[PDB]
Enzyme design. Structure first.
Site, PDB file in Angstrom:
ATOM      1  N   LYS B 300       0.805  -1.234  -0.061  1.00 56.91           N
ATOM      2  CA  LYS B 300       0.052   0.196  -0.061  1.00 56.91           C
ATOM      3  C   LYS B 300       0.906   1.231  -0.023  1.00 56.91           C
ATOM      4  O   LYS B 300       0.553   2.011  -0.808  1.00 56.91           O
ATOM      5  CB  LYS B 300      -0.993   0.043   1.198  1.00 56.91           C
ATOM      6  CG  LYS B 300      -2.047  -1.089   1.246  1.00 56.91           C
ATOM      7  CD  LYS B 300      -2.965  -0.967   2.331  1.00 56.91           C
ATOM      8  CE  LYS B 300      -2.097  -1.139   3.566  1.00 56.91           C
ATOM      9  NZ  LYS B 300      -1.690  -2.893   3.579  1.00 56.91           N
ATOM     10  N   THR B 301       2.042   1.316   0.644  1.00 57.21           N
ATOM     11  CA  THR B 301       2.741   2.416   0.811  1.00 57.21           C
ATOM     12  C   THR B 301       3.422   2.540  -0.517  1.00 57.21           C
ATOM     13  O   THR B 301       3.537   3.798  -1.009  1.00 57.21           O
ATOM     14  CB  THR B 301       4.028   2.336   2.064  1.00 57.21           C
ATOM     15  OG1 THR B 301       3.237   2.110   3.137  1.00 57.21           O
ATOM     16  CG2 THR B 301       4.775   3.378   2.166  1.00 57.21           C
ATOM     17  N   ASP B 354       1.613   7.713   5.503  1.00 60.69           N
ATOM     18  CA  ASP B 354       2.033   6.405   5.611  1.00 60.69           C
ATOM     19  C   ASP B 354       1.832   5.446   6.807  1.00 60.69           C
ATOM     20  O   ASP B 354       2.285   5.956   7.727  1.00 60.69           O
ATOM     21  CB  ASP B 354       3.288   6.339   5.215  1.00 60.69           C
ATOM     22  CG  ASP B 354       3.879   4.818   5.081  1.00 60.69           C
ATOM     23  OD1 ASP B 354       3.305   3.916   5.113  1.00 60.69           O
ATOM     24  OD2 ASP B 354       5.283   4.584   5.006  1.00 60.69           O
ATOM     25  N   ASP B 355       1.134   4.561   6.586  1.00 63.21           N
ATOM     26  CA  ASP B 355       0.463   3.777   7.732  1.00 63.21           C
ATOM     27  C   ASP B 355       0.025   4.521   8.844  1.00 63.21           C
ATOM     28  O   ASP B 355       0.571   4.320   9.970  1.00 63.21           O
ATOM     29  CB  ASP B 355       1.682   2.843   8.394  1.00 63.21           C
ATOM     30  CG  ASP B 355       2.303   1.982   7.256  1.00 63.21           C
ATOM     31  OD1 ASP B 355       1.606   1.494   6.523  1.00 63.21           O
ATOM     32  OD2 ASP B 355       3.534   1.325   7.469  1.00 63.21           O
ATOM     33  N   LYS B 382     -10.122  17.540   7.751  1.00 59.52           N
ATOM     34  CA  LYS B 382     -11.081  18.505   7.011  1.00 59.52           C
ATOM     35  C   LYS B 382     -10.632  19.720   6.351  1.00 59.52           C
ATOM     36  O   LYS B 382     -11.279  20.186   5.434  1.00 59.52           O
ATOM     37  CB  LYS B 382     -12.056  18.497   8.126  1.00 59.52           C
ATOM     38  CG  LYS B 382     -12.591  17.475   9.143  1.00 59.52           C
ATOM     39  CD  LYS B 382     -13.470  18.239   9.946  1.00 59.52           C
ATOM     40  CE  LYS B 382     -14.804  18.071   9.419  1.00 59.52           C
ATOM     41  NZ  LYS B 382     -16.082  17.386   9.885  1.00 59.52           N
ATOM     42  N   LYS B 459       5.084  -8.217  -1.054  1.00 58.35           N
ATOM     43  CA  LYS B 459       6.029  -8.181  -0.343  1.00 58.35           C
ATOM     44  C   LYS B 459       6.597  -9.289   0.274  1.00 58.35           C
ATOM     45  O   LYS B 459       7.560  -9.916   0.287  1.00 58.35           O
ATOM     46  CB  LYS B 459       6.235  -6.893   0.552  1.00 58.35           C
ATOM     47  CG  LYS B 459       5.353  -6.873   1.571  1.00 58.35           C
ATOM     48  CD  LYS B 459       5.457  -5.780   2.430  1.00 58.35           C
ATOM     49  CE  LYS B 459       6.563  -5.771   3.477  1.00 58.35           C
ATOM     50  NZ  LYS B 459       6.817  -4.377   4.241  1.00 58.35           N
TER      51      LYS B 459
HETATM   52  N1  ATP Z   1       1.449  -3.758  -7.367  1.00 58.80           N
HETATM   53  C1  ATP Z   1       2.171  -3.866  -6.318  1.00 58.80           C
HETATM   54  N2  ATP Z   1       1.852  -2.710  -5.243  1.00 58.80           N
HETATM   55  C2  ATP Z   1       2.643  -2.535  -4.422  1.00 58.80           C
HETATM   56  N3  ATP Z   1       3.805  -2.979  -4.427  1.00 58.80           N
HETATM   57  C3  ATP Z   1       4.450  -3.594  -5.345  1.00 58.80           C
HETATM   58  C4  ATP Z   1       3.608  -4.031  -6.454  1.00 58.80           C
HETATM   59  N4  ATP Z   1       4.551  -4.650  -7.398  1.00 58.80           N
HETATM   60  C5  ATP Z   1       5.642  -4.717  -6.779  1.00 58.80           C
HETATM   61  N5  ATP Z   1       5.901  -4.250  -5.414  1.00 58.80           N
HETATM   62  C6  ATP Z   1       6.682  -4.139  -4.553  1.00 58.80           C
HETATM   63  O1  ATP Z   1       6.465  -4.361  -3.122  1.00 58.80           O
HETATM   64  C7  ATP Z   1       6.922  -3.363  -2.254  1.00 58.80           C
HETATM   65  C8  ATP Z   1       5.927  -2.973  -1.309  1.00 58.80           C
HETATM   66  O2  ATP Z   1       6.454  -2.095  -0.339  1.00 58.80           O
HETATM   67  P1  ATP Z   1       5.535  -1.354   0.872  1.00 58.80           P
HETATM   68  O3  ATP Z   1       6.407  -1.017   1.920  1.00 58.80           O
HETATM   69  O4  ATP Z   1       4.346  -0.268   0.082  1.00 58.80           O
HETATM   70  O5  ATP Z   1       4.595  -2.707   1.317  1.00 58.80           O
HETATM   71  P2  ATP Z   1       3.584  -2.185   2.678  1.00 58.80           P
HETATM   72  O6  ATP Z   1       2.108  -2.194   2.223  1.00 58.80           O
HETATM   73  O7  ATP Z   1       4.093  -0.723   3.354  1.00 58.80           O
HETATM   74  O8  ATP Z   1       3.737  -3.378   3.784  1.00 58.80           O
HETATM   75  P3  ATP Z   1       3.534  -3.033   5.347  1.00 58.80           P
HETATM   76  O9  ATP Z   1       2.234  -1.912   5.351  1.00 58.80           O
HETATM   77  O10 ATP Z   1       3.245  -4.507   5.922  1.00 58.80           O
HETATM   78  O11 ATP Z   1       4.805  -2.434   5.677  1.00 58.80           O
HETATM   79  C9  ATP Z   1       7.660  -2.444  -3.196  1.00 58.80           C
HETATM   80  O12 ATP Z   1       9.126  -2.438  -3.109  1.00 58.80           O
HETATM   81  C10 ATP Z   1       7.317  -2.506  -4.589  1.00 58.80           C
HETATM   82  O13 ATP Z   1       8.176  -2.332  -5.589  1.00 58.80           O
END
Ligand code: ATP
Ligand code: ATP
Ligand code: ATP
Ligand code: ATP
Lengths: 484, 488
Positions: B300-301, B354-355, B382, B459
């Site tokens: 998501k991030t 983020d988060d 808001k 991930k």
């Molecule tokens: N479609 C996609 N969406 C998100 N990330 C992707 C995708 N394809 C590959 N990735 C890879 O997965 C990784 C996701 O990183 P991210 O930190 O956003 O996960 P996260 O949601 O923050 O996990 P958490 O919230 O548990 O920490 C990135 O390095 C990204 O390049």
């Protein structure tokens, strides 16, 4: 081109950027049409010998500036007054500049370990209102973040330099200058090798090297009334990235009382190899669940030993006793930062539930530490560095409630002895009871179930060893009867 | 008409209110019968090179003002003194004027770091001379202060400093102006870089302050110096900033990239871009809010960050748990507040949270969360940017349920689900895109998974792949399968 060990590429570029633009004579500057850079600032981890670099640079830039030194306090003396002084050392330079302004006077003023009036006072003098060029200032500080943002911006302090810990080639360079100096004079140690010392040390700051050589010199002086260098490697640091201390944590070594332990180690090995390989993610999180007691910490420590990373630092409550949640968090952040500094970082967290101060009654635990920790496991090291996190939890069940468990990448169980075979296996490897005694114990357990850690067992063992040689065995069976 | 990069229309207004009244000769003022304004104050974000503007005005208003410079400290010297010195500095221009008052002397005194200046009585002293009972007209004061708020209200007020000037970060056209002057001066001499184009540099940079902008150029001649013993400028772009805005950084947050393992991710990215367009075009609604909810390890991030490169906004920043550790509710609030203020300062921008669930400090038990941060978040959510300003905010969460019960979810305009892989074949597709395994093992996995159900975050999946690699070549795939089943 001497003398400064390591730091040649970074130094070369920085040197060029401040000095080269000034150096070209004389139409070149107008052709460039660029105002001379006002200052260069270096922020480094503590102990990097930034200062030696600064003295050398100051000497190198001008035949004579001749160097100006500023006390750290700067503003010491409350009554008027000092703040004005901070204005005053600059004032001499500005006066020279008004008197001769055009060409060609350069004055170097340096502040080591850099609120109210003084902030503004320095900012106004270094840049604006009118002129103030023809001088340069270098600031040395352990941490970038402490310092004010406004100075940082390109302009008054356009270039900021971060000084890394020495490269192995570089480490070889710092040792190399002192060693070479020893070389030039006839006396030297034949046994000691430059390449060898370099391969041996990764972590050390410059200082650390000069310190080691110096210690070797002291040892040599002592022998008259490898060698000394090897002895220095054996003791002298105190590196703070060395982790000699970590080895001690385990009083009794690792006992292979059974196969699960071996499985834990090959697994630990796999984790280490993986972090070593370096593709994708450089961060791995492990929590290992075992019954209260046994070598949770011991196993983690052995894995850390196995890894052989340059930097291993163990975060445990004992160091932190009585600290406020905030104080513990600060200490933790500090250690993790230190870990970020190493190219390869290994860290272990000790009794994670303890850190949180979980109390079964309630339940009340310190939230700040938990959130900080969760961010840290989530947190990813700056590029080029790989970080290893080891976490030991007495009980997972708290953690599952915590959602802590989700964050950790992998979890390893470390169960207590559950069979008589593993039991005798432990007594045998430990070698405490006599053959007859052990035979008796075996005749009192084989075919029966057991549930006891290793450490707890070690305890029962010594407690049984205290009783007369005729009461030891029976006492032992009396203890194993209560620890079921 | 030189030299000042950007700041022309505003410059015309600053010029006009103080200068127009005084310049017209001489009956015009009496016909107006209006007293000349005393001073002009400009307050700016750091690095706007405000000081250069001050120098120019000082040069420009009078053949000789003669210019007067004031140290920020002002109040230095306990013994007498500072009050007396301040009055002394104020007094001389006034004395000249009383001696000749009518025409034609105007005196300019320049003030830098006013916040230091305006403690106790000395601040009071400055106020008196400007608002003084007899005369004191024909004296002009300019003050440069980083923060307006700290300064006393009376100075802001009409009279001593009737006009207050706010200096915006340089416009792209303006940015082109700052670069253009130095480049042009370089143009005039024969040496120049042919490859470099002013429009290209301008399009490349939106955020940067003018002083900083000069600094890249400063970097560039120096690089040329190194060269003698795009081009160099391109290198400067690579390492000159230190922008303090955007800081390219995203690749560091998006470490492995955003592969197209699935149909959904593309739809979501497109949705985000559509919303970006909507932000860029909707005038009725100033502020846009979006929330991404997914099972943990969703990515998501990274996706939010991906959207942020996509908007291509002048100022992009991410509000991070990682940045803040060990703070106290009020500290978190201040940091968040400042960042959002930074977003208001830019004409249009996207700020990513983020988060969020982590940001609050929330823990499932209790549940326990820190209220002050949360309230701060809602009010901020808001809130409407200063008129003519548009802000894009992204929230990343996995605990949607908790937020919904909280009423956090309601504040967000829209939420996009970011589901973990559900079909094994799609997961395989992710594997070929990542391109890690050899052909045959992937075929074996395909035989294993096709027809079956799976719930794997991306991930988390990659991490599993890494885990699988470590084992021997004939021990890679089975290990992977075991991890997947165990995870099950
Ligand atoms: N479609 C996609 N969406 C998100 N990330 C992707 C995708 N394809 C590959 N990735 C890879 O997965 C990784 C996701 O990183 P991210 O930190 O956003 O996960 P996260 O949601 O923050 O996990 P958490 O919230 O548990 O920490 C990135 O390095 C990204 O390049
Ligand atoms: N790579 C290196 N280059 C130059 N000097 C070094 C290096 N490593 C260690 N030193 C030593 O460090 C000194 C200068 O740097 P120094 O270690 O003082 O920085 P520092 O951060 O001020 O140190 P400390 O924090 O220990 O006071 C020199 O006297 C030198 O002996
Ligand atoms: N086979 C073994 N496994 C683990 N530890 C061993 C073994 N043989 C000897 N030891 C020693 O036992 C000690 C284990 O203590 P440790 O605290 O790690 O166990 P524990 O059950 O986790 O206790 P605690 O509940 O206090 O954490 C170590 O110091 C180690 O050197
Ligand atoms: N857009 C711009 N217009 C004019 N000068 C600029 C611009 N950007 C950068 N500069 C440079 O910066 C200087 C003036 O801005 P300056 O950094 O003094 O503002 P400031 O915010 O008061 O600085 P600080 O607060 O760091 O002391 C000038 O010397 C000029 O060369």
């Amino acid at each position: 081109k001497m003398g400064i060990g390591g730091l040649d590429k970074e130094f070369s570029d920085i040197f060029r950027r401040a000095f080269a633009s000034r150096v070209f004579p004389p139409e070149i500057v107008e052709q460039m049409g660029c105002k001379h850079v006002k200052g260069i600032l270096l922020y480094g981890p503590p102990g990097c010998g930034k200062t030696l670099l600064a003295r050398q640079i100051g000497k190198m830039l001008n035949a004579r500036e001749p160097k100006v030194v500023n006390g750290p306090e700067i503003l010491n003396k409350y009554v008027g007054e000092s703040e004005a002084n901070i204005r005053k050392l600059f004032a001499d330079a500005e006066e020279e500049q008004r008197r001769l302004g055009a060409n060609s006077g350069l004055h170097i003023i340096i502040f080591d370990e850099i609120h109210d009036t003084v902030v503004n006072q320095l900012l106004s003098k270094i840049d604006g209102v009118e002129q103030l060029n023809n001088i340069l200032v270098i600031g040395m500080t352990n941490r970038p973040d402490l310092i004010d943002e406004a100075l940082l911006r390109p302009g008054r302090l356009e270039v900021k330099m971060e000084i890394g810990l020495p490269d192995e080639k570089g480490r070889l360079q710092i040792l190399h200058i002192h060693t070479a100096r020893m070389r030039g004079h006839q006396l030297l140690s034949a046994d000691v090798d430059i390449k060898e010392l370099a391969v041996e040390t990764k972590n050390f700051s410059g200082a650390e090297l000069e310190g080691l050589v110096r210690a070797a010199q002291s040892t040599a002086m002592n022998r008259h009334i490898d060698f000394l260098a090897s002895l220095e490697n054996d003791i002298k640091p105190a590196f703070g990235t060395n982790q000699e201390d970590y080895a001690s944590y385990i009083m009794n070594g690792i006992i292979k009382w059974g196969d699960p332990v071996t499985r834990v180690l090959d697994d630990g090995e796999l984790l280490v190899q993986q972090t070593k390989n370096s593709d994708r993610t450089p961060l791995v999180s492990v929590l290992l669940e075992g019954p209260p007691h046994s070598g949770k910490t011991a196993l983690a420590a052995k894995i850390a030993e196995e890894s052989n990373f340059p930097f291993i630092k163990i975060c445990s409550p004992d160091k932190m006793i009585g600290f406020s949640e905030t104080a513990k968090c600060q200490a933790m952040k500090k250690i993790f930062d230190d870990a970020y500094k190493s190219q390869l970082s290994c860290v272990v967290v000790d009794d994670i539930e303890r850190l949180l101060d979980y109390v079964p009654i309630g339940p009340r635990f310190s939230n700040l530490v938990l959130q900080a920790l969760l961010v840290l496991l989530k947190k990813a090291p700056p590029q080029g560095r790989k970080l290893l996190i080891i976490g030991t939890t007495s009980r997972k069940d708290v953690l599952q409630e915590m959602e802590m468990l989700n964050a950790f990448s992998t979890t390893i169980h470390v169960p207590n002895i559950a069979t008589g075979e593993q039991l005798l296996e432990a007594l045998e490897l430990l070698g405490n009871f006599k053959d007859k005694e052990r035979t008796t114990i075996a005749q009192q357990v084989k075919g029966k179930k057991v549930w006891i850690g290793i450490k707890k067992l070690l305890m029962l063992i010594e407690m049984s060893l205290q009783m007369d040689p005729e009461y030891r065995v029976r006492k032992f069976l009396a203890l194993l009867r209560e620890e079921g």
